[PDB]
Amino acid sequence: QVATDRFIQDLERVAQVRSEMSVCLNKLAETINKAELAGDSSSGKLSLERDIEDITIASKNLQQGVFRLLVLGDMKRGKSTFLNALIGENLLPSDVNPCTAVLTVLRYGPEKKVTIHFNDGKSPQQLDFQNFKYKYTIDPAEAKKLEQEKKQAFPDVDYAVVEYPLTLLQKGIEIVDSPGLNDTEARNELSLGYVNNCHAILFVMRASQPCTLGERRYLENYIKGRGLTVFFLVNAWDQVRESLIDPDDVEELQASENRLRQVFNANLAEYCTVEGQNIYDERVFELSSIQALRRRLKNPQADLDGTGFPKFMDSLNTFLTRERAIAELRQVRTLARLACNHTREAVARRIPLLEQDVNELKKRIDSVEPEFNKLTGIRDEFQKEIINTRDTQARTISESFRSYVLNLGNTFENDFLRYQPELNLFDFLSSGKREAFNAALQKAFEQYITDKSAAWTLTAEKDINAAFKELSRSASQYGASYNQITDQITEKLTGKDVEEDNSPGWAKWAMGLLSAGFDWKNILLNYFTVIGIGGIITAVTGILLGPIGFALLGLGVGFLQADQARRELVKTAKKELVKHLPQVAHEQSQVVYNAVKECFDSYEREVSKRINDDIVSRKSELDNLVKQKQTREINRESEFNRLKNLQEDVIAQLQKIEAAYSNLLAYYSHH
Asked: Which residue segment(s) compose the domain that 441 sits in?
């Protein structure tokens, strides 16, 4: 049994396990809800609304959720051949043209349909696959002419969704096939959007040309240090041979492969170490996609030994179905355990109060007021801590920004020189070469700024994370303190009392145990979309190009030689850039402030809600009863039994959920 099937096998197992949990959660929420919509005509509702939705929401996200693979890399690396081999057929056309390719999403569908999304406002055009393919394919002529120019072949085209009945995509896979590194940079819904919310990044490189300037630039800007799981596929491994002095020499070949392997290890090792642990061998794979495509084209089920694929697919398997899956499900059983315990505990307070009435009930409730005040006091003290942090952090990260932005004039030479456009003798005399250069100058500053600000963000992230980790710990304490008070409530109401962390529901959410913890990255990233960036890069830069052209005329370039012109460019550049440093550090620092502010404000808002929902629930649960006793008359025994049944029904669905999880983990442990 080959790795291709073993992956499809495992993947379907998880889908099954996912499917049952979803069915269990639906029956669970339905159970609670039915008990409730029969409650306020019986003994009164336990206030379990907050748990019904969390259950419902989670159930929906199980049936819909899917593993996302984001595929990145330059053109002419065999990215689409790699994907083709992965999926099983020659479906994507090969990425050899800088402006013909367009962002493609790929997912399961009964029939071969393609849904086109546009960028110039017009309605998402839907068309069948062969229809699509014939229209959006250009002839080898037109492609050259558009390429030798500027024009993206489909200006109106944002992104295409392709649905296909590929079996790999059936078992819960989605593939986002991005264009090259530049075109992706140019698109923030990619370089920040998918990069940050996808399960794994598939980075395609070619063996012949290890670690391009452009590749390590991308990796450093968008991947270095933000702890993502990226697989690196060194493609066209079998063509190391072209470069050889003597193509027929095995010793020269092994030498040449070994030092090639070294380059990859020098530049990538750092990307494959997670928490001190080196796992290079489970991330960096030497593939021969073409051989893999050829084989699978002749036989969908062929053995792929020798192509590199079996070892890569194993690791991808273990990551998705053993790590990202066990994680997804762990939280799901926690939610169940929460919903289930909140019911169990609620019925536990209700039962003993049934046979009481009603001045004794009112009396008991009054005896507990000092403590609801204590729960409130926790909400308010944690509230004040969260805000205090959103004020400390938003200030610190703003100054950190100013401080970075002002200190740019220092490491400028070393940093800029690797972007700076070359400028030989009579160039600045020809209006056309002066444009070609000017565009290149445009692109240089863009690249420079993008490198520098991406560098700084990586340093802010570190602080942001450090804060949320400490807020997670306070949530843990306040949670424990919250439980004290909460059992004192159950005691003062009844008389008698009753390794996986059980702090209260809200605390878990606040701790990030239920959902990479709390998703500030996306809060931050959605807020940056509703402003621009955008106006960060190309706009800021434009204020510099004019006055550098001015200055370059002032020292007579066009009559200077590449060496003379170089020297004078950097200096002109530096002098100009520092002329706008104060104004950028002023206007933009306040935008950072507000971003970091909405970050912790967002958290503060969800948390206060969840702590109040709990307090309000607990108050409602008691008050409902009071209203019952005053108004309705009930059969104490019927109700007792209806309420004991609830505990029974719910604890049952829980056991199914816990068994499904249990069985999966047990299958993995012995296999």
From this structure: 1-671
Residues in Cβ contact with 252 at an 8 Å cutoff, skipping those fewer than 6 apart: 244, 245, 246
Phi/psi for 183 (5° steps) reads -55, -40
Q: Which residues contact 618 (CB under 8 A, 6 or more apart)?
A: 47, 372, 375, 486, 489
Here the tokens at position 116 are 């086109």
SS3 201: strand
CB 206 within 8 A of CB 99: no
Percent helix / strand / coil, the chain, rounded to 5: 65, 10, 25
The answer to whether the Cα torsion of 603, 607, 608, 613 is positive or negative is positive
How many angstroms separate the CA atoms of 158 and 147, rounded?
Answer: 19
Tokens of 658: 């816990």
Q: Provide the phi-psi class of 44: left if phi over 0, else alpha when psi is between -120 and 50, else beta.
A: left
Resolution in A: 3.0
Report angle CA 480, 484, 488 to the nearest 5 degrees.
160
Total number of domains in the chain:
1
Verify cis geometry, omega within 30 degrees of 0, for the bond prior to 358.
Answer: yes
Contact 72, 176 (CB under 8 A): no
Q: Helices marked H in 318-412 — which ranges?
A: 324-354, 359-367, 369-406
Q: Distance from first CA to last CA of the chain, Å, rounded?
A: 15
For 81, other C-beta atoms within 10 Å of its C-beta total 23
* 37 CB burial (10 A radius; 0-12, 13-18, 19+): exposed
Contact present, 545 and 620 (Cβ < 8 Å): no
> Which structure tokens are listed for 340?
């289930």
Determination technique used: X-ray
Q: For CA atoms 666, 314, 3, 113, give the dihedral sign.
A: positive
Extract the tokens encoding 636: 């104490």
Give dist(CA 541, CA 416) in Å, integer: 14
CA distance 623 to 669: 49
Q: Please provide residue 279's backbone torsions phi and psi, each rounded to the nearest 5 degrees.
A: -130, 40
Residue 600's contacts (CB-CB under 8 Å, 6 or more residues apart) are 386, 387, 389, 390, 393, 394, 467
Q: Are 275 and 71 in contact (CB under 8 A)?
A: no
Residue whose pair of structure tokens reads 């039962």 in the numeric block? 351
What CA–CA distance (Å, rounded) separates 224 from 654?
Answer: 41
Measured in whole angstroms, the distance separating CA 399 from the mean position of its chain's CA atoms is 28
**Do the Cβ atoms of 557 and 565 come closer than 8 Å?**
yes
Q: How far apart are the C-alpha atoms of 505 and 509, rounded to whole Å?
A: 7
Residue 523 to residue 468: CA distance in whole angstroms: 13
Q: How many CA atoms are closer than 13 Å to the CA of 280, on its beta-carbon side? A: 12
Cα angle 501-504-508, degrees, rounded to a multiple of 5: 65
Residue type, 300: P
3-state SS record for 217-261: HHHHHHCCCCCCCEEEEEECHHHHHHHCCCCCCHHHHHHHHHHHH
Three-class SS state of 650: helix
State the Cα–Cα distance between residues 668 and 671, nearest whole angstrom.
5
The DSSP 8-state label assigned to residue 273 in this structure reads B
Element (H, E) at 126: strand 126-128
Q: Give the C-alpha separation, 250 to 287, whole Å.
A: 19
- Rounded Cα distance, 258 and 247, in Å: 16
Planar angle of CA 247, 248, 249, nearest 5 degrees: 95
